[PDB]
Amino acid sequence: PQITLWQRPLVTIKIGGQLKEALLDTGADDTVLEEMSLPGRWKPKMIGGIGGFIKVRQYDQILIEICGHKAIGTVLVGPTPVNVIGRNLLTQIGCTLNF
Amino acid sequence: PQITLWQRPLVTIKIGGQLKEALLDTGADDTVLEEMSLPGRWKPKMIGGIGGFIKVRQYDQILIEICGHKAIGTVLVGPTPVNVIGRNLLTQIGCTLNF
């Protein structure tokens, strides 16, 4: 698809058997989602932006489906105010910026 | 152009006659630059990042070039982790997300 930026580029995703709304965010190095359970190992990380930092759990090799595409990547889980899909997974679906 | 996301989408901008590096951020609603001088009067604005909301300075109808494409719009000034070019100017230069 070609997605306009007149509005926030929100997509639905499936992860953990769960459906979630998320922002396609080229500014985010990694995908960050609100508190949820995920399988496997993880490690603690601090991520930050305007307003400061939050602590997240970093899970790797997580299966996610996005716009009918299945991708594998890192998911940061923690108290974010906005779920975003970061570059780490946008590359896997072949997403590019164009003007 | 077409910009992939394996690396941060950093581009050169020109504002106030000076060159600066900035991140193309489709997660940012607005355009937020590091502390700098801009002409005219400003207005207060609160923007929300991952660690919370903060006040920044809002300047309207400011000329700014993004990768050589000329724009004129709202530029916010404040303690942003990096210069970000948000949807208000990305739409202006005709930028979309594609996959």
Ligand SMILES: NC(=O)c1ccc(S(=O)(=O)N(Cc2ccccc2)[C@H]2CNC[C@@H]2N(Cc2ccccc2)S(=O)(=O)c2ccc(C(N)=O)cc2)cc1
């Ligand atoms: N309103 C506006 O214009 C606005 C809002 C908010 C900001 S921000 O400063 O917060 N900012 C830019 C940013 C921050 C840090 C590095 C490079 C660029 C966010 C916008 N897109 C990416 C950022 N994030 C997603 C987000 C947060 C809030 C609203 C919408 C989207 S995030 O959750 O901070 C995050 C941080 C870091 C990582 C990581 N390390 O992977 C992942 C995620 C700027 C502008």
Ligand SMILES: [Cl-]
């Ligand atoms: Cl103020």
Ligand SMILES: [Cl-]
């Ligand atoms: Cl604008």
